[PDB]
Amino acid sequence: NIENTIKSAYEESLNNARFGDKIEEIDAIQSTIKSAKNVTVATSNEKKFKVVSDIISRITDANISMLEIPTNSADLTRMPALNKGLIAVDSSDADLIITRGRLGIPGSGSLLLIMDKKGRILTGSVSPSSIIHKNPIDKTVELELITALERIGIVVK
Amino acid sequence: MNIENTIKSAYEESLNNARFGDKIEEIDAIQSTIKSAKNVTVATSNEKKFKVVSDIISRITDANISMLEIPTNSADLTRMPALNKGLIAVDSSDADLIITRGRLGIPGSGSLLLIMDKKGRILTGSVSPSSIIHKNPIDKTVELELITALERIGIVV
């Protein structure tokens, strides 16, 4: 479980022995994602929700839901994607939260995060502002999610 | 013109949920901030990584470029290590621009590179997989991360 991998990693960083990631840490992240029973997507856009739900449904046996609470208030924070995720974390009992929003300030493009029930960040990906790169939003969200999963060893084809 | 302005303007739209897309001004402010930096801190004391970053950054700004001598290992016991490493540089120096790279989230979540300004605001960034997932020379990983982070706000290296 990630509590365990986190506790062990914390103890070793202090030892100045943190010399790379471990397969156990990846395995724990994969397990957390695949075993999720209730997944919340921090969006109210039905088109983005469908893109996310269709992918996540292939790797979980979960109830997947949109977040009912609007999340635009997070756009007045330093890390909007993150804070949208925390709204879902703090107001529901989702096992897994998928959030997408601005990375940082206006113009900084998008960040997608997969977070666990405590708001811990498991994986993520970024995409450019639409000013910089024109792309259908559904293809953008799809690539973000597939990328975030691939980089912790989950391949969806 | 500047990031305070674009931020104030974007926040005002967001209060209405009337924020529908990014603006060219926002990208312009980010580029101007990067290009006009007087002092850049790279949040590392590894000279090989510093050279990779410096060689790229020196071509887009006339800033003094410096390493961070304060070790950053402590940030690995935080929820967002790359971010908190960056904030060490923000809070302990008078850098205009901070380039930081470190863990995205929990152990196993791979790496996040961020470009932050003098207040710790996030201008752009990029992610790379854990070495467990993708084996790769560290300096070419950092090079790709930095180029990607620059290109997504319209700076071509």
In this structure, what are the phi and psi dihedrals at residue A73, rounded to the nearest 5 degrees? Answer: -60, -25
d(CA B150, CA A42): 28
Cβ contacts of A105 on chain B, cutoff 8 Å: 3, 6-7, 26, 30, 121-123
Residue with tokens 């935080």: B78
B115, B98 Cβ separation under 8 angstroms = yes
Q: Quick one: how far is CA A123 from the chain centroid?
A: 6
CB atoms within 10 A of CB B60: 15
One-letter amino acid for residue B74 of the chain: S
**Resolution of the structure, angstroms:** 1.7
Give whole-number Cα distances, B83 to A127, B55, B66, B78, B147, in Å.
18, 23, 18, 9, 19
Q: Name which of A131, A135, A155 to mutate to probe chain B: the one with the most chain B Cβ atoms within 10 A of its Cβ.
A: A131
A6, B106 Cβ separation under 8 angstroms = yes
d(CA B80, CA B123): 16
Sheet architecture: strand order including B97-103: B64-67, B39-42, B97-103, B111-117, B122-128
Domain parsing of chain A, residue ranges: 1-35, 36-157
Contact B10 A75 (CB under 8 A): yes
B38, B97 Cβ separation under 8 angstroms = no
Q: Fold for domain A36-157?
A: Rossmann fold (3.40.50)
Contact B121 A9 (CB under 8 A): no
B137 Cβ under 8 Å from any chain A Cβ:
no
Q: Quick one: how far is CA B92 from the chain centroid?
A: 17
Give whole-number Cα distances, B14 to A72, B22, B45, in Å.
7, 12, 40
| Exposure string for A19-51, b = 16+ CB within 10 A, e = fewer | eebbeebbebbbebbeebebbbbbbeeeebbeb
CATH code for residues B37-157: 3.40.50.10150
B147 Cβ under 8 Å from any chain A Cβ:
no
How many residues appear in chain B?
A: 157
**What part of A 12-31 touches B (C-beta under 8 Å)?**
13-14, 16, 18, 20-23, 25-26, 28-29
Resolved by: X-ray
Instruction: Look at residues B99, B106, B93 and name the one whose alpha carbon lies nearest to residue B52.
Output: B99
A150 Cβ under 8 Å from any chain B Cβ:
yes
Instruction: Assign domain B1-36 to its CATH architecture.
Output: Orthogonal Bundle (1.10)
The CATH number fitting domain A1-35, selected from 3.30.1330.20, 1.10.20.60, 1.10.287.470, 1.10.10.60: 1.10.287.470
Contact A120 B126 (CB under 8 A): no
How many residues appear in chain A?
A: 157
Beta-bridge partners for B65: B40
Helices (H) and strands (E) in chain A, counts: 5, 5
Sheet architecture: strand order including A121-127: A63-66, A38-42, A96-102, A110-116, A121-127
